Amino acid sequence: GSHMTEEEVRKIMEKLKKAFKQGNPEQIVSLLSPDVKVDVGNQSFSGSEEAEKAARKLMKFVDRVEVRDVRVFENAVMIAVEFEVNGQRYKMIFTFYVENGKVSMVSIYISPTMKKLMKQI
Amino acid sequence: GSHMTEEEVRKIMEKLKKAFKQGNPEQIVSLLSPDVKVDVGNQSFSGSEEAEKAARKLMKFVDRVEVRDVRVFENAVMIAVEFEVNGQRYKMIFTFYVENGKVSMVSIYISPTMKKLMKQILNYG
């Protein structure tokens, strides 16, 4: 009545996984709920518009994307990625929490070395 | 030079799991980095002492804890729990990101029905 079956979460996982693998950010943005909450480093973003703006900014600095692993846990889709920015490689973890077929919350873990870089972006 | 092995992460996972199941928050607080960042709903907390305060507030209202499932993903420990508050059961997911043997960041997913309740507890508990 308000939750998502494993099958439903898996469908969104496949979409997210495919989008990351193709380096296709627009598919992921379309999966965000209008009031999506994004947490990355000290920064926090509210709303799909703010999230889309942030995603586009980040992707402009990213020269290469590699998907290391993807896992589903309850209504959470976790994606471990490596981004190349200016010849340097950074590992990040994206967690997508799904409600009603869309992503309500995004938690992004970034390494301390990327924190300095991420402030610029 | 800066990472944690799967074995070290799993050790902390076991500690976190035991603390939840046995209902002993001080064990969790002891694993938090001094500058731990916690996000739950609209609330945000910085520092272990502040996180400790939030944990104590919550535990005042939580009458039962059930650890439904636990998984390790890279340096993230995810714990799915059910909390009982005032006779009602809520499902939550706690994600603990580990750095250098302690938890640097905590991300908590809560269902929309719990959102109002959690704001009361964390602000006014």
Ligand SMILES: [Cl-]
């Ligand atoms: Cl449901």
Ligand SMILES: [Cl-]
């Ligand atoms: Cl290391």
Ligand code: NA
């Ligand atoms: Na949410």
